């Protein structure tokens, strides 16, 4: 199956790699619940014309909280401690670790995170329906092809990389459309709004790039380097969680600050 189950079935997990990963995943869904409350409570602070962005942030928070909670429980209950060896190992009587929860979260959140900026900025020469359709098509294809490659993570590293490269083609199309959206959205808004939009672009670029980084993380030190271990598992889940908080919660806070800035007129 996946690299997490491979490690848990051969070398097992140290108590520190197991507990750290449980804690980081728990932090992940706890932040989404706090974000859910934040976006509900602050919807009164933006003009009606921008509130669809707060609404979409709140729906993403629900998606992420429920599915990261499921992923968290799946991590903790998939490995049991062997007192003889002193490590956690894959439990044959459990469900085994499954990354489907996170991939389903991506299929849901990606179309909504890309959609919601179109309710705060105005396009100029681009058409709303054209940008929306390009975001939704390439976002869904990016996740589908990525999910396929994920099946070959352990069994066929070459198919793993080929599918992930196909997925990356769709990712670069998204980055290209988003850059055009940001550029058109900067036209004829205030300098303070243009500065926030520049920050949104940098946040978007870095936080979304973290996801392919975490996808590749165990092979980034080679076919048997330092990361091809429980340390690549800790690092992959830490980088996912950082990307999750950044791409969903911080991105949404910044769009709300932009909406407030744009009401000053």
Ligand X SMILES: *C/C=C(C)/C=C/C=C(C)/C=C/C1=C(C)CCCC1(C)C
Residues in touch with ligand X (CB under 6 A): 106, 109-110, 113, 142-143, 146, 164, 167-168, 171, 208, 211-212, 215, 244, 247-248
Other beta carbons within 10 Å of 105: 23
Other beta carbons within 10 Å of 264: 8
Is 104 near ligand LFA (CB under 6 A)?
yes
Q: Pick from ligand X, ligand LFA, none: which does 197 bind, CB < 5 to 8 A by kind?
A: none
Dihedral sign (CA 94, 226, 18, 107): negative
Q: Pick from ligand X, ligand LFA, none: which does 1 bind, CB < 5 to 8 A by kind?
A: none
Longest dimension (CA), the chain: 69
Other beta carbons within 10 Å of 101: 18
Is 194 near ligand LFA (CB under 6 A)?
no
Choices 5-13, 121-129, 180-188, 251-259; region in contact with ligand LFA by CB under 6 A: 251-259
Q: Which of 149, 144, 261, 139 is nearest to 199 (CA)?
A: 261
x/- map, 20-59, ligand LFA, by CB under 6 A: ----------xx--xx-xx--xx----------------x
Find residue 80's DSSP bridge partners. 89
Q: Pick from ligand LFA, ligand X, none: which does 208 bind, CB < 5 to 8 A by kind?
A: ligand X
Residue number with the shortest CB distance to ligand X? 146
Find residue 13's DSSP bridge partners. 88
Choices 10-18, 110-118, 123-131, 183-191; region in contact with ligand LFA by CB under 6 A: 110-118
């Amino acid at each position: 199956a996946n690299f997490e189950n491979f490690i848990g079935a051969t070398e097992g997990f140290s108590e520190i790699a197991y507990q750290f990963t449980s804690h980081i995943l728990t932090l992940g869904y706890a932040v989404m619940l706090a974000g859910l409350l934040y976006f509900i409570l602050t919807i009164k602070n933006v003009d009606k014309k921008f509130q669809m962005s707060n609404i979409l942030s709140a729906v993403v928070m629900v998606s992420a909280f429920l599915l990261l909670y499921a992923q968290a429980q799946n991590w903790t209950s998939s490995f049991t401690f062997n007192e003889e060896v002193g490590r956690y190992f894959l439990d044959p009587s459990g469900d085994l670790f499954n990354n489907g929860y996170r991939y389903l979260n991506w299929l849901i959140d990606v179309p909504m995170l890309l959609f919601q900026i179109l309710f705060v900025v105005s396009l100029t020469t681009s058409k709303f329906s054209s940008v929306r359709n390009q975001f939704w098509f390439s976002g869904a294809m990016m996740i589908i092809t990525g999910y396929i490659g994920q099946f070959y993570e352990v069994s066929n590293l070459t198919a793993f990389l080929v599918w992930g490269a196909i997925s990356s083609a769709f990712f670069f199309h998204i980055l290209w459309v988003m850059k055009k959206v940001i550029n058109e959205g900067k036209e004829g808004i205030s300098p303070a709004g243009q500065k926030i939009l520049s920050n949104i672009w940098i946040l978007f670029l870095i936080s979304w790039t973290l996801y392919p980084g975490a996808y590749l993380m165990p092979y980034l030190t080679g076919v048997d380097g330092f990361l091809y271990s429980e340390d690549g598992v800790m690092a992959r889940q830490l980088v996912y969680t950082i990307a999750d908080v950044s791409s969903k919660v911080i991105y949404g806070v910044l769009l709300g600050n932009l909406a407030i800035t744009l009401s000053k007129n």
